[PDB]
Structures are given as C-alpha cells and as structure tokens.
C-alpha cells in the first residue's frame, strides 16, 4: 500500500541539487508521503527553495533547521547519499504518486463504508465523495477561462504595436522569407525539413551566421550529424567564398589562405556555441540547453537534426519516439522562452511523386511531429535532380505551416560551391 | 441496514387502502425492499393497479391463483395512519440509499486494490461515484415505463419549442436545418484536409453558442496554444487579419476593435485546456470535473489524431478507432454533444476517412469541409460543408461563405 | 516457493461475498494453500456455502465456528478487510495455483530422489509418478464418454417431441425466419451482423417488442451505442407509426401526440429493462446480467453492440480482444440458460465487392468470433445503395450459420420512415 | 548406486564362457555400467561375437592389438555360476534404473524451480516422466541395430496381415486404398471451406473406427458443444434430418431409431472434450492422460484455427504454423495418428491453404473436401475428397457419395 525506498530517493535527489525540487513539486505534494518524517522534509525544502532559490546549501539548510528547532542529521546525509538521476527521479516520483492515489481511493472507500454503517444523508456523502475524487484528480494542469487568456493576448498585441521592428522576433536574414513568416518568436518550435543533400544544414549555418553578424546575438547549435570542425570549416567556406572541396582536399593558394585567416578572425568575434555530441537524449539536450541559457545568454537554439535525437526510454514503434522527441522540443522552446529550430529528414517517397517537391504528408511519415511546430519550412532543389534546367543555382523555401498567414513559397539563391544561401534580386 | 417492520407497515397500509399504494409508489420502488417476499408482494400490488383498482382482499387471492395468505393477513393487522406512512417510507428509502453507499465504499476499496495506471483508477472511480449519485441505486437498469414517461415529457418540450433546432445550433441556419442539431450523448466528427478551416469552424460554433444561446463550452486544443487560439477568435470577431496583428502593422482603429472584442469575449463563458498530448482517460477525467463544476453543454476536441489511448495499440488504425469509442463513451456519460476534429490524408468522401482508422462506424454525425479555391479558375468566395453520415439517413451538402483573410464563416 | 499475501485475498474475498466462493472453488482446492490456517478456512467456507448458499452471514459463520469449536476472530475480520475485486480475485487465484503446482512438482522430485536413494521397484515409482503428475494435471474440466452425453441428448429430443410449440424456444416474431431458424434456444449465442445503417439496432427492437407483446416475456438490452431515451423514442415511432424525424425535430400534430401517448401506455405494460452504460467490460455485463436474471426473470438478453464491449485486460492486437469478448458472451449465454443476442458491425470491404451483400469472411475480419455463435444472421439493404431499383422498401435476412439446417435467405419488409421491420405477404 | 563387484563378476563370467555373454546381453546393455573401463570391456566383448565366437583369451589380445590384460585376468579369477549370474545381472539393471529415477527427481525439481506458466511446467514434467518410464534410461538415443530388428518384426506383421490397410482405416475403401492408412506418429489435415462436411466426415471416420475396428477415439471439439456434436452423429446413424429432430416434427418411428442409435453409440468407446479455446499445451496434457488411461488410438481436433499456442505470436500465420508443429509433436509423442480440421479462406488447392498460415510443410497428409452442388446445373449427388500432399508422392482424387439431409458420407 506504500513504498518508502521510492520516497527515500525523491527526498535525496532534492537534497543534493535544489533544481530538482521544483521538478518534484510538479509531480508530487506533501501528502503523497506515507511518512510524517518525509512530509516535514518535503515541507522544509519546498519552502527553502523559494526563499534561497538555486544557492541552497547543506550548512545553510542545517542552520535553518536549528533556528526552527525542527532539527535534532546523519539521517539527512544518508538521504543525500540516496540521490537518484533526473530520469530515475521522474520514474520514482511517478510510482510514489500512484501509491498515494491508491491509498487515497481506498481511504475514501473505508470512510464511505463507515459513514454508511452510521446514519448520514446520502446527498452529503456522495457530494463529498465527488469533491474528494475531484481533489485526487486535481493532484495537475487545469482549465482556463477566456477572460484571463484574453488579457494576456491583448498585452501581446500591445508589444507588437509598440515595436520599432520591421520583423518582430529573431530575423532569419532572408528578406522575403523573413517578411512573410514575420520572424522567429520566443517560445515556439520551427521545423526545417528536407531530403538529404537539400542544404538544410547549410541553411541553418546561414541563419546563425546572419543572426550573430547582423543582430549581434549569440546562438547555440547541437550538431548531431557533423562535427564542430566540419561545421566551422564549411562556414569559413561560406564567409571567404573559397570552395569547400579545395579546402578539404588541401589545394589552396596563399591568397586563398589569407582570406580564410581573416574569415577566422571575424568569426571569432561572433558568439556561437557548438555541441557535436553524436546522440543526445531529450533529457541530455534539455540539461545542456538550460545551463547554456543561464551561463551564456542565447536567444536562438538549433538542433541538427531531429531523427538523431532519442527518448530517455526507447519504444518499439519508431513514430512514438519521434513524436515524443518533437513534443519535448516544443516544451523546451517554451521553457527557455527562445525560438528553437529543429532540422528533419524526409523519406524516399518524396521523390517518387511527379512533383518532386516536399509536402505535409511526407513529414507525417515520420510521426505526429506537426501537431506542435509553430512554423514548418521545406527546402527544394529541382536542380538537384538533373543538369538540364537552364532553373539551376536556385533553391526554393516552402512555407507549409504558418500561424500568422497563408501557405506561400520563397525563392532564394544557392551556391553549391561555397554551400552558401543568399538573397536573390 | 433495513427494517422489516418499518417497511412491513408500508405493505400492510397498502393492503388496507388502495389509495395508499400510489403514495408509496411516488416515494419508493420495489428495489428498496430488503426481503424477496416484500418485493414480490410489492410487485403484485403495484401491478394490481392496472388490470381492479379497489378490491382489497380478493384480487390478492386472484393474484395468488395465477401465482402466504395467512401471513399477509398478519401484515394487514400491522398498519398505520397516512401521515405515519410518509415518514416510514422516507426511512425505508434512506436505509436503501445507505446500502448503495456502503456498496460503493466496498467497490472503491476494490478499485484501489486493483493494478492499473492511477489515472485509470481515478477515472473508473469517478464513473462509479457519478452513476450511483445519479441513480441512488447500485443497479443501472431501467424499466421502460419510467423511460417512456420521461421520453413523453421530452416530446412535449420539443413540440412546445420554437424551431429552429431542438438540439444545439451551429449558428449556420441551413446546416442546422438539415441536422436536427447537436443532441446530448452523441459524437460529431468534423473532418477536412489541413487548412480547410475546421479549427476556425469550431471557433465559430462555440462563439455563436456562447453569444446567442448563452451556453458554456469547453475546448481541448492539442494543436495550438490557448493564447494562440484566442488571438484567432479575436481576429475573427474584430475582422482584423492575423498577419497585421503580429507584424505590428496594425492601427489604433484596429486596436480598439480588438479590445472591444476582448471585453465581449470575456463576457462569455468558455473554458480552454491546451495539453500537447492527452490520453483519452485524462480528457474524460478533466471533462468529467468540468461538466460537474462549470456545467458545460458542449465539448470540442482539436484534433482527433492527437489523442492517445491509456494502453497503446497496434498498429495505428485500431488505436485511432479506440479513441473514437472512448469519445463516444464520454459523450454518453456527460450527456452532452462532443465534437472531435479530424485530418484527412474531387470532394472529400467517406473512403478517405476510412483510411484514417475507420471512425465513421462510431460516429453519429460526420461533417466534411471543402474549399475549391484552395486548390485553385472560376469566380468564387465560397466553401462547402458536406454531410457524409447522419443517423437520420440522407447525405446532403450545405454551402457557406468563407473569408480567407479573417478566416471567418458566415451565412449567405 | 509460496505466496501468502495472495492466499490472504482469496480467503478475504470469499468472506465478504459468498458468491465469490464457487469462483474460487473452480480455480483452487484446499491444498493449494501453504498454511493449515488457510486450509481450514477454505474447508469451512466451502462446506458453509453449500448448506446456506447465498445468505451466508458473519454472525452465522461465527455461530457455526463456535458449535464446531474450531473458532477461538479478529484475524477473520482482518481477512475480510483484505477482500479483493472479482477481476483481481481471478488474478490472485491464478498466482496461488501456480505456486501450488510448483510446490507439488518439486515435492515429487524430492520424493523420487529419496525413493531413488532407497531401494524400491522402478516400475512402482514411475507409475506413481505418472499418477501424481496426472493428479496435478487434473487439479480441471475433463473428458466425457459418449454414453453419458447420449442420455442427455435423448432427453432433449424428448422435450422437443413433447412440445406443443410451432417454434421451440423464443420466437423472433418474423414468421419465415422463425420457422427455418427453429427459434432462439436457451444457452446459445446469436449474432446479428450488418454494416452501419443496415437496421440491426432496429431489428433488435423489433425482436424484443414482439417478445414482450406476443409472448408476454421480459427482456433485457445493454445498449452501448444509443441512450435508453433514443432507443425508447425510436420504439414509440415503430409502434405509433409516427415518423422519427418529426418526433426529434419537434413538429407534431395534436393527433400525432395522442397516438404517441397511447403507445407509451402500452409500452409501459410490457416488461423491458434497459442499460445504456456506454462501455462495459465483459465482467461488468456478466455481473449486471446475473443479478438482472435473479431479481427480474428475463428469458432474453440483447447486447448492442459487440465491438463496444471490452475485455477486463486490454491486449495489443484487436482480434484477440474481440475473440475473447465473443467467448465470454457464449459462456454467459450458457450460464444464464437463456438465449443471448449480440450485434456486430461489418468493415468497409463488404461493399467493395460486386455482390454488395455480407459473407462469412466479412465477419472473420473482426476475429475468430464465429467459432462459437450458435446462429449467425446478416442484414442487407440493396436499396441502401441507391434510389434506382424499382426492389426498395425491402430488406433481406441471411442465415449464414445454423446448427439445424442449410444456409438460407429470408426476405422481409422494412419501413425507413418509422424504422420498423414487418412481415411481407 | 552401482556395485563394481556385482557387475564386475558379470564381466569375469563373460571372459570365462562365450555362451555367458548372450545371457547378459539379453538382460542388460553397455549403458548400465557405472565404470568406463567396464563399459569399454563390455563393448569389445559384445562386438567380439561378430567377426571369433569362441576364442576366450586371444581375441581379447586381438582386440587389444587394434585398441589392462593383467587386470582382466584378475577379473577372470572372479566369476560365478550361471544361476548366480542371472541374479547379479538383475541387480545391476535395477541400480541402473535407480540412477535413472534419481536423475528424473533432480530434473523435476529443476522444472519446478524454473519460471513458466504452470501448465507448461506440468506439460514438460509429463514428457520427461513418460520418456524415462518408457526408456528406463535417461538417454533417448537408440543404436540402429535395435531399431532395425524392431522394424523387421513390424514388416513381418505387415506381410502377415490381410490388407486392406496396414494403418487405421477411414471406412471409405477407395480413399483407404490410395493412402496407406493412418499410421502412428503422423499429422493428417482435413481442410475445406465452411459447410463442406469436414466435421461430419470426421464423425464418419471415428464412428467407422469404433464399430468395425473396435478402437477407442478422442475428439476435441472447439467449435460445437459435446451435446451438439453427438446429436449430429445420432442424426447420421438413424438417418433422421436434424431440422426434424429440433423442430419437434419427428414421429415415433423416427424416435425408436434414435434411441437404438443411442444404445449402439453407448456401446462404442468415444471420448469428447469441448473446451471453447484450448491452448496446444492444454490439449497435449489432456491427450497425454487420455492416451495413458483409456488408451485411445486416434485423436481428432475440430478445428485448427481455434487452437492457440502457450505464448502468443505475431501476426497470425506464424502463430498458426506454431500450432501445427505442436500437433505434430503430439502425434509423435502419443504414437497415434492425429487429425486436425482446417478452414479455407475451381477445386480447392494448396495455395489457398498456404494463405492460412502454411500448415502444409508440417503435415504428413493433406485432405481437401469439395462439393460442386454447394456452389450450384448438372445431375449430381456426389462430393470429392482430394489429396494435395502425401508423403508417398502423387496427388490423386477420390469421389464419394454425400447426402445433404443426413450429412452422411458413403461409399459409391
Ligand atoms: N563538403 C561539400 N563539398 C561540396 N559540396 C557540398 C558539401 N556539402 C554539401 N554540399 C552541397 O551543398 C548542399 C549542402 O547540403 P547539406 O549541408 O548536405 O544539407 P543536408 O544536411 O540537408 O543534406 C548539398 O546538396 C551538396 O550538393
Ligand atoms: N492572412 C491570411 N491570408 C490568406 N489566408 C489566410 C490568412 N490567414 C489564414 N489564412 C488561411 O486560413 C486557413 C485557416 O484554416 P484552419 O482553421 O487553420 O484549418 P484547420 O483547422 O484544418 O487547420 C488556412 O488555410 C490559411 O491558408
Ligand atoms: N433517427 C432516424 N431517422 C430517420 N431514419 C433513421 C433513423 N435511424 C435509422 N434510420 C434509418 O433506418 C435504419 C436504421 O438502422 P440503425 O438503427 O442505424 O441500425 P444499425 O445500428 O445497424 O446502423 C437506417 O439504415 C436508416 O436508414
Ligand atoms: N436439413 C438440411 N438440409 C440440407 N442441408 C443440410 C441440412 N442440415 C445440414 N445440411 C448441410 O450439411 C452441411 C454440414 O457440413 P459440416 O460438417 O458442418 O461442415 P464443416 O465441418 O465444414 O462445418 C452444411 O453445409 C449444411 O448446408
Ligand atoms: Mg546535414
Ligand atoms: Mg487546426
Ligand atoms: Mg446501431
Ligand atoms: Mg465444423
Ligand atoms: Sr464515525
Ligand atoms: Sr524413506
């Protein structure tokens, strides 16, 4: 009817890292604990976290205990030992919650029988039972009346009205796309989806370069696909307009080198953070993105690419794993209050159709990703298909999903040599 | 917890006077009696009314001929005054109500004892608590006599009402004409290709419902944020295009319109929950509470494929079909119409929907949306609402106006 | 090697509700219990249930304990507390049985080694081992010789011979179908299967109406699809011949109302019980059907419809769940000793064939339902398909499975307006 | 538990006289000896018989040339009288039998210790107990010499028998002619579309088997009740149509015929189990006991798809194929022919059966039933039995008569 070993880890994980506390607070409340010992500890830490926030210590906790007189400590240290990982922490919180809910239900049953054996009004008992089951149901996210939501929406309209910006939110750097898309707003998820070799990795690089150079803003990229050196080397080729194949092959002119050196200096000026760790769990990416957001102030985060990410617990069907990863990414974007852009790859059936450009259906094949991506961009290169079209050297960016406006298409220039996207005229 | 003597006196009093029996029949029924012998005598006495009204001891014998005469005569000796009787009838009912509660208590303990996801346990616990609260009896079967009378009263109400529609109106006159309306306990499915304006059509329905019918509604938006959704509706009301809103391109004339729309919308009662992925069980639990607390007469879910079952099924279609069944069960339980939106992979037809996991079989009403201008020609400003399935019978089509910029539906 | 917590619940569940005892008796025997304490309790209750049957109390049990002197009681009350649900009861009985069987096997092994170390005849030991494993195997349903079965069959033939009935068993109300089908016999499962909108819900209503009116017999319907009000409202339309669409729309003439009122009076005369609970588990339906059979005496039960029912434990493939539900329904029909009729829906592929009528294969698509349904009926409306056939207003009932006779087809009249089936001429 | 000296004397006695060795060879074999040295000397001595019959010490040396001579001479000194020898041979065998039992005991403990469904544990426990009981030795391998002699004896029995059929006859002469018959340890599959009379054909087989061959049979009827099935057979015997039986339409002349058929059927030994859904493991356990207790020489299962494996498999075909393998294993273990009926989704052919989960590969014999009148013409009263697969080789077809009303099969 209860599990202590579980509660032990919940309290312990809260002791070692304070940040863990809120996470537990979302999952649990003081009274899912069977032990009064634990309910007190849950209470004091819950209060302590708000007052001291992140910098909560063990000596500081001890001093607070002494002032209260609540304390009489080795046990606390033992609990600290018992600390468990964030993923396991979520797991043990869940099992604690289920036991608690089970206890609560059985208790209601016991009471109703007792009340029933005694003589009381039927209406009173059932209404209270309704209230009690409602309370158990509440213990999480609730319903919102339109009046409260309306007030926040109006405030958002005010901020848009009061802005001096041609494009609200972070600009992409590509004028026609940037105008019709209205930009990248804080807390939304953007999806750049294209077939392999369509230049989405390059497009990401163009975006982050344009952001750092023109807007003077820092960005972060998790590159699961290519190493940080390859990413930077490609970027230098984009800046200096020295062909990438020559750089990698090792054939360069002294004049070409000086151009590359200068490009390196200018790039060093810009603030850009790279993580090339090959396969990250959503939990891993979340942790890294959190701290990177705190230490460095990043207004944009790119993940390349989506399919390379994996859930903390693997499932058998592929689609559920993707859909889960997507759902987390959107959750992260909101949490960080910055735009998050995830890249995605398209399956073979895209090119089996006579149109040869991407469609919404092609993305579905990967899962129910679309449901919460606030903007969806496709990349297409007809040229990719063959030599012949006299068109070539051009690439088209399709705007499959917008919250603001209708479906539209934007044509831009793409130079295969330097792997650089540029505005047409 | 029942009394043989307290109710036993009810039977005696019924034997003595045949005018006593309708009085007890009003207060209590056969199920409330603890003893089979009392229930049986209660049964025959109630049935005695139809087919001699006042023969007080020889129809008793007559009933015995087709079916303890000394014993009932002993019961005859035990009887009480009519003022006495109402009191003892009340105590018989409460003891019966007591049993129902105790039974519920035992069941609730059992549920806790079982092994299920706690959400499931909470969901199943709510259903039993609500059913017993409504019925006052553990048993859910109803004799047709009781149902028939209630139906007749309902028929009176339908006749005496000025139609329009006996069910909840969409706000669109012609569609509302072909459909009886949205009745309590049925599932309505709005299915269309992406960008056909089904999300907007839902907003139009709930808005028209709130303003004209003064009725509360609930929307579960799995796709777009509660904030995102609301701006939409404000855009529909004030007729200011979303692109202008966001761009910062708007003017003061635009604003005040948006503010007024915000005030007007705040007047209406509409509840929103945006949870990115809901299980059907979560949704019923939440809708369960929302129906009790705020009394919402309509529920919209956007959209269907975003929902998932408590236990995952294979591969897809069965999982989606499972969701449909759950929503239907929700509509039945909450006794309100529930509308779920669905996405589709010339016009659209039923076959296209079947590829999506065969929802058509569990649905009481199916609506499609089609916008010929979206495919792109010929002069047009219109979008058509198709009815694939109606419990009544015929498939029919309703045109309506659609404004691309405001994403607003209107009667022609 | 054993589980007490399990045995605790088995005894407890028997204490609170006597009816639970036989269920346990089917699953378990006195000696699957590791505790002598439990074996005594199992023994006394097993004996007690037969003598007192359903009305077995706690004071009465205590008095019996005292007369025996077996008793010396708080523990018994604690056991009563420990009572578990019917579904869980089945689950814990299973785990008790497995431990018991495991113990039994290991014991045989121990003995054989002991016997082996000692000097005994090989033939004697192995034969006894064969006997012992046979006993474990027995502890459930056995083989029946044809001689015993023949005697019961002959008795059934006698009852058919000695009957004054044109149709033995419950009549359907439709003369041609009723004659060739020979009727609905006690303890068999009938399946009415048709595509959505083919009028099976209406056909059920016709059957139950005809039963109550003509034969003066009570019936029960579990309507998972439509509410009790909708079901009754439709039925009133069938009786009064007032079109259903007018009733629901609210357009009626005072003359039409009086007809409806009279129909309500006549319907109130008939005994029909309705349960509109939306999704029932097989366990739920079984419990309700049991008590409804005991309190009210119902000779017919209809379930509309099959796919809406669900097993106590959900499985991943759909077909296994259906097949399980079917299997339970047949088991219920036998148990209740009354005919049980379940309605089933047919998938899209029925109308993808040029014949456009249902076939046995169409039903298979839903699972191995057919294996035990004692009669299978299909409904077909060619008219449903289009206006044109000059035929219309007619519906055909196909007799796919019969135990008595060959495959046959019966044509009947169907009025779309009133949603009523009627005999043709 | 063996004795070096007790058996050691057996070896000595074999050294002394070459007429002693066939006496011990009759009682015991090489496996019964505890020591490798004894087994090896036993081996060479047994093989010494074929290729000098009576050289008592120099073939010993001869065997040593191609392969402890002082030691065996010590064994030579230890020997005993021929009456003595039979006794010590008996004790060697029993100690050996002892070991087999103890080994079985250890294994049985292990099985209990493992984690499986208890039915599985009981099934696996039975198989080991039966094999050791039959073999008297833990090991199941047999040298071909022993098998060859048994085969030869069997060949004698086949030759000296008046055929007809060396295997179990169906009752239908021409079919029985083309098939050797139903032999012990093989799987026969009767596959046909619904209503082709495969259930009836089975009843005809088991009836003809019981009446003429005086042999017991077992049927697992998963589809129809034991009562339902039996009436059928009574209908077949008395030639009274089922529709008349049930309708109450029958006459006294009909009855007595049914009663006589009931008496005649009661004379025959036939065992029925109707369990709606059986696992294959349950079926073997039950058939295991039924074969031992009542000694049934034939088993029929109606029908195949209704069976299910101990562990569920995906999606379907593999699950069904698994069932086939299990039944084959059952036929092998019980050493009797096992016949399973199957349903099919011009004539019917092997391809149609393969769609059903590829049973053809595990089956020793495959029979199809076809009734051209059922499809409906031309004058006809006949149904054909097709052989798709025979271990011998050729596919062939056998006509037979079929009476629609009695559902009865007969020779033309
Ligand atoms: N190292 C390289 N050398 C030469 N051309 C390249 C190189 N990398 C990419 N390209 C060209 O430019 C495009 C770059 O796209 P890429 O970076 O592969 O995006 P994605 O990750 O979507 O495949 C490719 O289509 C290819 O034609
Ligand atoms: N500013 C605009 N100009 C033109 N069309 C627009 C504008 N804003 C929205 N739309 C159109 O309105 C439609 C909204 O449909 P929506 O309700 O989102 O459909 P669904 O519910 O299927 O997602 C989109 O198809 C979009 O093309
Ligand atoms: N409320 C109604 N109003 C008008 N016609 C109806 C109504 N309900 C059913 N019908 C007609 O009569 C038939 C009733 O069948 P229905 O009750 O839907 O059985 P099922 O459950 O098999 O679909 C339908 O085919 C339809 O044409
Ligand atoms: N009274 C009857 N009149 C005509 N045909 C009948 C009668 N009774 C049974 N039959 C036929 O006999 C056949 C019985 O076949 P059956 O052994 O059940 O086949 P299966 O084993 O494939 O189920 C059915 O096809 C049925 O049509
Ligand atoms: Mg890439
Ligand atoms: Mg939408
Ligand atoms: Mg229906
Ligand atoms: Mg059959
Ligand atoms: Sr109290
Ligand atoms: Sr001993």
**DSSP assignment of D79-113, as one string?**
---HHHHHHHHHHHHHHHHHHHHHHHHHHHHHHHH
Extract the tokens encoding B130.
């609500």
**What DSSP character marks residue A99?**
H
Which protein residue's CA is at the shortest distance from atom 27 of ligand 4?
C406
Look-up of token digits 């959503």: A282
Q: How far apart are CA D165 and CA D143, in angstroms?
A: 29
Whether residue A337 sits in one domain with residue A272:
yes
Contacts of C162 in chain D (CB under 8 A): 248
HSE (CB half, 13 Å, CA atoms) of D300? 26
Whether residue C183 sits in one domain with residue C39:
no
CA A193, A195, A199 angle in degrees (round to 5)? Answer: 80
Q: Is D316 marked as binding a ligand?
A: no
> What was the experiment behind these coordinates?
X-ray
Which residue among D118, D242, D247 places its CB closest to the CB of C97? D118
Test C146 with D275 for CB contact under 8 angstroms: no
Which residue among A151, A182, A320 places its CB closest to the CB of B246? A182
Q: How far apart are CA C251 and CA C239, in angstroms?
A: 18
**B3 vs A: CB within 8 A:** no
Q: List all residues 6 or more positions away from D78 whose beta carbon is below 8 Å from its beta carbon.
A: D5, D8, D9, D12
From residue D354, alpha-carbon distances to A242, C131, D360, D362 in Å are 64, 41, 7, 12
Counting the structural domains of chain D, the total is 2
Look-up of token digits 């009729």: C341
D386 bridge partner residues: D368, D397
Provide DSSP, C324-363.
HHHHHHHHHHHHHTS-EEEEEE--GGGTTSTT-S--HHHH
Judge if the beta carbon of residue B356 lies within 6 A of ligand 2.
no
The sign of the CA dihedral A75, A81, A82, A83 is positive
Buried b (16+ CB within 10 A) or exposed e, A330-344: bbbbbebebbbbbbb
**B290 vs A: CB within 8 A:** yes
Instruction: Give the residue from chain A lying closest to B308, CA to CA.
Output: A320
Look-up of token digits 């984690």: D115
Among the three residues D156, D179, D214, which one is the final residue of a domain in this structure?
Answer: D156
Contacts of B240 in chain A (CB under 8 A): none
Is residue A277 classed as helix, strand or coil in its secondary structure? coil
Q: Largest Cα–Cα distance in chain B? A: 94
Looking at the complex, report in whole angstroms how far the Cα of residue C92 sits from the nearest Cα belonging to chain D. Answer: 14
Is residue D171 classed as helix, strand or coil in its secondary structure? coil
| Nearest partner of C214 among C182, C167, C257, C180, judged by Cα | C167
B338 bridge partner residues: B187, B299
Q: Which residue pairs from D183-186 have beta carbons closer than 8 angstroms and sit at least 24 positions apart in sequence?
A: D183/D337, D184/D331, D184/D335, D184/D336, D184/D337, D185/D331, D185/D332, D185/D334, D185/D335, D185/D336, D185/D337, D186/D331, D186/D337, D186/D338, D186/D364, D186/D365, D186/D391
Choice among D30, D37, D223, D384 that is catalytic: D223
Question: Cβ-count burial of D63 within 10 angstroms (0-12 exposed, 13-18 middle, 19+ buried)?
Answer: middle
Q: CB–CB of A419/A381 below 8 Å?
A: no
Looking at the complex, report in whole angstroms how far the Cα of residue D129 sits from the nearest Cα belonging to chain C. Answer: 7
**B115 vs C: CB within 8 A:** yes
**D344 vs C: CB within 8 A:** no
Whether residue B244 sits in one domain with residue B219:
yes
Test B144 with C316 for CB contact under 8 angstroms: no
Q: Ligand 8 centre and the CA of B298: distance in Å? A: 51
Among the three residues B156, B191, B219, which one is the final residue of a domain in this structure?
Answer: B156
Please give the helix or strand (H or E) that residue D335 lies within, else none. none
Task: For chain C, positions 361-390, list CB contacts with chain D under 8 A.
Answer: 361, 364, 368, 371-372
C420 bridge partner residues: C415
Q: How far apart are CA B30 and CA B47, in angstroms?
A: 11
Q: How far apart are CA C172 and CA C182, in angstroms?
A: 10
Whether residue C412 sits in one domain with residue C350:
yes
Whether residue D198 sits in one domain with residue D148:
no
End-to-end CA distance of chain A: 72
Which residue among B117, B122, B305 places its CB closest to the CB of A137? B122
- C-alpha torsion angle, residues D79, D82, D88, D90 (rounded to 10): 150
Whether residue B189 sits in one domain with residue B176:
yes
The helix, strand and coil proportions of chain A, stated in percent and rounded to the nearest 5, come to 55, 15, 30
From residue D287, alpha-carbon distances to C128, C130, C245, D191, D283 in Å are 19, 14, 60, 22, 6
Test A149 with B223 for CB contact under 8 angstroms: no
Looking at the complex, report in whole angstroms how far the Cα of residue C411 sits from the nearest Cα belonging to chain B. Answer: 22
The sign of the CA dihedral B56, B57, B63, B67 is positive
Whether residue A291 sits in one domain with residue A158:
no
Buried b (16+ CB within 10 A) or exposed e, C40-67: ebbebbbebbeeeeeebeeeebeebbee
CATH code where residue B357 lies: 3.40.50.300
Instruction: Give the residue from chain D lying closest to C126, CA to CA.
Output: D133
Q: How far apart are CA D386 and CA D372, in angstroms?
A: 13
A399 bridge partner residues: A377, A408
Question: Cβ-count burial of A53 within 10 angstroms (0-12 exposed, 13-18 middle, 19+ buried)?
Answer: exposed
Whether residue A80 sits in one domain with residue A208:
no
Q: How far apart are CA B31 and CA A157, in angstroms?
A: 62
Looking at the complex, report in whole angstroms how far the Cα of residue A330 sits from the nearest Cα belonging to chain B. Answer: 9
Q: CB–CB of B105/A113 below 8 Å?
A: yes
Instruction: Give the residue from chain B lying closest to A156, CA to CA.
Output: B246
Which residue among B112, B248, B271 places its CB closest to the CB of A106? B112
**What DSSP character marks residue B357?**
T
**B111 vs C: CB within 8 A:** yes
Instruction: Give the position, in ligand 1's atom list, of the atom nearest the Cα of A234.
Output: 1
Look-up of token digits 């209630």: B150
Test C368 with D113 for CB contact under 8 angstroms: no
B396 bridge partner residues: B387
Q: How far apart are CA C303 and CA C284, in angstroms?
A: 13
Is residue A365 classed as helix, strand or coil in its secondary structure? coil
Q: How far apart are CA C155 and CA C151, in angstroms?
A: 6
Test A146 with B265 for CB contact under 8 angstroms: yes
Q: CB–CB of D164/D213 below 8 Å?
A: no
Domain that holds residue D20: 1-156
Q: How far apart are CA D96 and CA D391, in angstroms?
A: 40
Whether residue A188 sits in one domain with residue A83:
no
Whether residue C106 sits in one domain with residue C175:
no
Q: List all residues 6 or more positions away from A415 whose beta carbon is below 8 Å from its beta carbon.
A: A393, A422
Judging contact as 3 or more Cβ pairs under 8 Å, the answer for A and D is: no
Extract the tokens encoding D82.
């021929």
From residue C39, alpha-carbon distances to B17, C8, C256, D299 in Å are 56, 11, 69, 39
Q: Ligand 7 centre and the CA of C204: distance in Å? A: 9
Q: CB–CB of A4/A34 below 8 Å?
A: yes
Q: How far apart are CA B316 and CA C25, in angstroms?
A: 41
Instruction: Give the residue from chain D lying closest to C111, CA to CA.
Output: D105
Among the three residues C163, C180, C204, which one is the final residue of a domain in this structure?
Answer: C163
Whether residue D232 sits in one domain with residue D138:
no
Cβ-based neighbour number of residue D167 at 10 Å: 17
**B66 vs C: CB within 8 A:** no
Extract the tokens encoding B382.
């219109």
- C-alpha torsion angle, residues C13, C15, C17, C20 (rounded to 10): 50
Whether residue B103 sits in one domain with residue B182:
no
**C318 vs B: CB within 8 A:** yes
Q: List all residues 6 or more positions away from A247 whose beta carbon is below 8 Å from its beta carbon.
A: A233, A236, A237, A260
């Amino acid at each position: 009817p209860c599990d202590e070993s579980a509660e032990r880890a919940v309290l312990g994980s809260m002791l070692e890292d304070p940040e863990n506390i809120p996470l537990v607070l979302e999952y649990l409340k003081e009274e899912d604990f069977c032990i009064d010992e634990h309910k007190l500890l849950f209470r004091v830490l819950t209060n302590l976290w708000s007052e001291y926030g992140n910098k909560l210590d063990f000596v500081l906790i001890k001093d607070h205990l002494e002032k209260k007189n609540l304390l009489q400590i080795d046990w606390l240290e033992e609990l600290y030992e018992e600390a468990v990982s964030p993923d396991t922490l979520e797991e043990v919180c869940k099992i604690v919650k289920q036991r608690s809910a089970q206890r609560a239900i059985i208790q209601l049953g016991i009471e109703l029988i007792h009340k029933g054996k005694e003589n009381k009004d039927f209406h009173t008992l059932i209404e209270e039972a309704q209230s009690r089951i409602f309370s158990i149901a509440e213990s999480s996210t609730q319903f919102y009346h339109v009046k409260d939501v309306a007030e926040e929406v109006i405030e958002l309209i005010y901020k848009f009205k009061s802005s001096d910006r041609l494009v609200t939110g972070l600009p992409s750097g590509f004028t026609e796309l940037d105008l019709k898309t209205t930009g990248f707003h804080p807390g939304d998820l953007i999806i750049l989806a294209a077939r392999p070799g369509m230049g989405k990795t390059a497009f990401m690089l163009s975006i982050i370069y344009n952001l750092a150079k023109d807007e003077g803003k820092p960005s972060a990229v998790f590159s699961l696909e290519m190493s940080k050196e390859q990413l930077v080397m490609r970027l230098l080729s984009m800046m200096s307009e020295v062909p990438l194949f020559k750089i990698r092959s090792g054939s360069i002119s002294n004049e070409d080198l000086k151009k590359l050196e200068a490009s390196a200096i200018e790039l060093a000026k810009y603030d850009i953070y790279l993580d090339d760790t090959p396969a990250l769990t959503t939990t891993d990416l979340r942790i890294r993105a959190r701290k990177l957001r705190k230490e460095k102030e990043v207004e944009f985060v790119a993940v390349d690419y989506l399919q390379l990410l994996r859930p903390p617990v693997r499932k058998s069907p592929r689609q559920e794993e993707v859909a889960e990863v997507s759902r987390n990414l959107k959750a992260l974007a909101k949490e960080l209050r910055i735009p998050v852009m995830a890249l995605a790859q398209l399956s073979r059936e895209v090119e089996k159709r006579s149109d040869k450009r991407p469609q919404l259906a092609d993305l579905r094949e990967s899962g129910q990703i679309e449901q919460d991506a606030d903007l969806i961009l496709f990349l297409h290169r007809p040229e990719y298909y063959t030599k012949k079209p006299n068109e070539q050297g051009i690439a088209e960016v399709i705007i499959a999903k917008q919250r603001q406006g209708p479906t539209d298409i934007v044509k831009l220039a793409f130079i295969k040599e330097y792997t650089k996207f540029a505005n047409l005229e």
